[PDB]
Design a protein around this ligand. Sequence first.
Ligand code: ADE
Ligand code: ADE
Ligand code: ZN
Ligand code: ZN
Lengths: 266, 516
Amino acid sequence: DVKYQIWKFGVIFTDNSFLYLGWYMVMSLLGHYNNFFFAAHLLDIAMGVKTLRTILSSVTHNGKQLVMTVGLLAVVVYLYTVVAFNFFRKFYNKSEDEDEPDMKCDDMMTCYLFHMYVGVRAGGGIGDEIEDPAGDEYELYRVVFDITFFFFVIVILLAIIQGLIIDAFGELRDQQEQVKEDMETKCFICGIGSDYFDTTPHGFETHTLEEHNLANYMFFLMYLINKDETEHTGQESYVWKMYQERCWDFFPAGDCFRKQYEDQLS
Amino acid sequence: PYLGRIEIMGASRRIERIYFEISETNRAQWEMPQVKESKRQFIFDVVNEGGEAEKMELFVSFCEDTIFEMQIAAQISEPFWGELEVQRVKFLNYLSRNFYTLRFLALFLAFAINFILLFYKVSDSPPNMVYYFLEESTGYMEPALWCLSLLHTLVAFLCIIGYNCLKVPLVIFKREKELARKLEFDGLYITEQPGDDDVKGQWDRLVLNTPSFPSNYWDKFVKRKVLDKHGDIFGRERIAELLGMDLASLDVKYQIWKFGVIFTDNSFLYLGWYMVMSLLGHYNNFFFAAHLLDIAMGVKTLRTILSSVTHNGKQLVMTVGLLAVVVYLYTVVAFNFFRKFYNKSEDEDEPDMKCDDMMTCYLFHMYVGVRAGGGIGDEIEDPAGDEYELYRVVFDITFFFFVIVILLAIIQGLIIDAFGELRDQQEQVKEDMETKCFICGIGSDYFDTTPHGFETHTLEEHNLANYMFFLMYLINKDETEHTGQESYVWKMYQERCWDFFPAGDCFRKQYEDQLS
Ligand SMILES: Nc1ncnc2[nH]cnc12
Ligand SMILES: Nc1ncnc2[nH]cnc12
Ligand SMILES: [Zn+2]
Ligand SMILES: [Zn+2]
């Protein structure tokens, strides 16, 4: 079937894992051309090691927020660049030579590039990086500029990323705790709380290992699929018909054998 | 489909079910995404900062606001004096319906103008006052900038007009409704007479005698109701002269009051500031670079991230003041003992001591000591080879710990804690909505006795959407056409008594004996 083969090839080519393996092979081939291409395979540890994958998920959890805050940092640095370009052209000079001074804020693009390059990567704002403001009429304006840069651009806008990562670690930990506690406290299939089952000793364990085991439900489903039709019992035919009609009423919800027949079981 | 179900505490003091008809247009207004967002915000706010006593009050207020919003949406939606009036109202409706698209276009224009301005250059010679010129080889970007600035100012003007024609009615309706409630059920201007500490009350005092006081609020009989309620105490003639009513027969002032209200309105003020800076861009183009911060009010994720830091603005101000105080204390300590070291001049002829003056030493500390990564000792003269070695090393180390590490880690801790508290707020509101019924408060554990019990109860029996639809149905339906239960609920609503809302009870709890 040529059409089916074409469709299958399209599906597998769209598949992400197959695409990743194809890229792995392409870089492996290009290593033969330029050996250093084999140094790009070392990042496969991210997809390989489970703990590394979890740690990287801790930061990719808030990738959208990180992009948003980086855009906010770019916006505020551009605003400070405009503020500097309009008033403080003198100070951004990096050339000691008097014959050919190098002013790094005459051009708007150049001043923005200078800010994005060195002002953020400096530990004390831009005032510590560029010409000293003392002995000038704009002393107060420029010290306010430098201090506001230090607070709003370095402290807060590089602590937001750390807060985002810490919060992501926390939210992941609470997700794991919540799923574990929910599994411990409730029956997955029926939803009845464990407090009822703990009336008798080991009641919840017995219920979840003998009565409402999801593994047992899956085994029953595969048993129905494997067993030839017209060989089903009445209950098996009922469940098979429900499955073919895709109606999940047969799954017990809020009820169980003990709840149904406690009058005779007690 | 178009059938609504509710449960009330009827006159027989038992839970009773009421059926009514829901319109297709109203339903479409309900699943409108703007109304969905408003509902989400209302649920979050009430669950997070609302008690059970006033919860029904807040719910009814939100229902009334939503009803007014859908009425305005239906009004503006569309499926020589007369012709010009028709054209004008059509244009106003178009602006009202496309306010959000115009705002997005304004943001795009701001980004485009800023990007074009990113090719600014300075040249002393014409292309000591410098002649500013924009450098580019293509040649069309200057006319592009001029056209973009004109079109952006136009877009801002249409945005303000659309806001005035769309969202101002909500503010006017809310203010008039609150004034009517405080006049009737509280007698704020009859007995209480606020002690000049409520500027809002003083401003609303003007509109009392206006003829068309209930312009948007539906209850036009507020004057008659308050007169009937407070006659025997105040005086019929004095109530009539206070309210402007023609007792014997039983708007410039209103326009001024409305203008004052809209001018006080924060969103209108922000849009006015946007237009002012857009105009001042024509004077000095770099004023268009101040519109780029509109992304904070524009993008939802940016707004949430900025709320994460504005949550503790008071605490951040307090800790910055504490940092200023401690740096001043260290400045005093240095000024009294360590004047030698704060020298930044290598030249021996003219040494520059930066701690002889108290103001100068404080400025030096606030400027460089905090922004240094290793305290002030790494920034100023080395302490070795001196008698004050121990004192100065203790000074530097205490500065490093108390001023740089702790007092710049407090801000990071505050931001992290704010992120955490916001996350727990969202988790708590979601879990409360999942585990309890909003209207009645009965836990979900009872309803999960039968399969899908809680879902059926919250989608058929106690749906807040159904309650809002019933309330708007009562408002729309003409009086003297109400059924007995409808008249009962209407009377309760007019008396502002929320006993009819089921609290801690439901139809299943009431009649399980026959339902089982
Ligand atoms: N029904 C169930 N089967 C297996 N593990 C469970 N954990 C909780 N409920 C369970
Ligand atoms: N009564 C109710 N209506 C709609 N959503 C709900 N979530 C919880 N209770 C609800
Ligand atoms: Zn179970
Ligand atoms: Zn309920």
